[PDB]
Amino acid sequence: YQLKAVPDIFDEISQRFPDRVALIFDQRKITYRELAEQCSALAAVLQNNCLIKGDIVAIKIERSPELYIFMLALMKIGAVMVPVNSNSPERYIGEVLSAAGARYLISDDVTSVPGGAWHVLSSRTLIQNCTQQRSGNYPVLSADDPALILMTSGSTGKPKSVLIAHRGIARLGLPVPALGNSERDCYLQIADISFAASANEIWMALLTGACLTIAPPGLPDLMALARQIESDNVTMLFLSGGLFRLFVEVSVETLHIPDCVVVSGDFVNPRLFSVAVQAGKAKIFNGLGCTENSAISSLYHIQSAPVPVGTPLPLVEMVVFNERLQPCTCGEYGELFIAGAGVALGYSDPQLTAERFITIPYQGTDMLFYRTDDRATYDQDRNIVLV
């Protein structure tokens, strides 16, 4: 429960599991030792290319081993990464970079980037200049230092910048009791990198010694995904509601190859969960995530199909408060508030942060909560349910 910055956890994990497979792309496999060496070589290049701690650096790199190498190397030098979907239109990309205050954009295709205040660097040319020579003077990083910026948005899709601390994703190295996950597991990287949900896949894998098999770039091809799940022995499968429901409709057997399936997003129609759970013995979970809590935040194990939020992940606390910030009684409707290691550092404007990140005395601690938009209450057993 003493959390470190991501590069420090990864250093420990890679030293402890150097021979385990960290990344799979098509049929290419990269051990933790190989990945660690490439991250170190690239971090030295990034220091050579005038990046420093605190720099806001966007990443626009298609799914590939290099994408994750850049994530690790940027965090090692203390940069704040801003991952961008490669399929996003140029205007929304400019909107994201402007919202984030990005100063640099690292891309695997510099010809498809919007013009703005940022400086564009070529990921492929940077990789090309990597030497075996590792370097050495990296910044001291706290679990509370910024690591990442994700966007959230309302009805109109205008992006709002969310600053994520190292601890917010470093917590994903803590094994989740309901999942039973460990270094023996394999995850599938398919969520878009600009989504908090992508952190579930990347960091639960790489901060535990487990394997991350990387989906091909582009929109999902369920035949290729089904082959990938089987061929690469995916054991922890995170799916959006849409991808989950579509697999139920067209290939439900694929869902029972893994040990655990976690469904993120707005609740899928329970009839579809009913079909899925009747079709095999995989443990199927409804997951609750929140961009302002960095990643997946709670899990409810669906055995039969309001919506229970289930059991929070390690170092996550959840409470339902009403409009006057009082803990709700049974059946009283309020909002879900989330506290703990995942809570974002805030938004880019501090007046926006002050109204949604609220300190409330709870069970003896003056605890910082994020106020979600999720309406909720308590059931008769003091379990949180969404309404």
Count of residues touching Cl ion (by CB under 5 A): 14
Q: How far is the CB of 169 from K ion (least distance, A)?
A: 19
Query: Given the structure tokens 């959230």, which residue do they identify?
Result: 152
What percentage of the chain's residues is helix, strand, coil (to nearest 5)? 30, 30, 40
Q: How far apart are CA 140 and CA 166, in angstroms?
A: 12
Options 8, 58, 60, 62; binder of Cl ion; rule CB under 5 A: 62
Q: What is the DSSP letter of 139?
A: P
- What are the E-state strand segments in 134-256? 146-152, 160-165, 186-189, 211-214, 236-240
343 binds Cl ion (CB under 5 A): no
The length of the chain is 387
Q: Which of residues 235-294 bind Cl ion (CB under 5 A)?
A: 264, 289
CA dihedral sign of residues 175, 181, 186, 189: negative
Residue 44 token pair: 């030295």
Q: Which of residues 293-322 bind Cl ion (CB under 5 A)?
A: 296
282 binds Br ion (CB under 5 A): no
160 binds Cl ion (CB under 5 A): yes
Q: Which of residues 200-219 bind K ion (CB under 5 A)?
A: none
Options 2, 19, 115, 156; binder of Cl ion; rule CB under 5 A: 19
* Cα dist from 321 to 89, 203, 296, 325, 378, whole Å: 39, 30, 21, 5, 10
Q: Which of residues 263-282 bind K ion (CB under 5 A)?
A: 264
Q: How far is the CB of 218 from K ion (least distance, A)?
A: 24
Cβ neighbors of 349 (< 8 A, separation 6 or more) are: none
Q: Which of residues 172-211 bind Cl ion (CB under 5 A)?
A: 197
Taking CB under 5 A as the binding criterion, the range among 149-157, 164-172, 178-186, 260-268 that sits at the site for Br ion is: 260-268
Taking CB under 5 A as the binding criterion, the range among 42-50, 160-168, 181-189, 283-291 that sits at the site for K ion is: 283-291
Site for Cl ion, rule CB under 5 A? 17, 19, 62-63, 86, 160-161, 197, 217, 264, 289, 296, 347-348
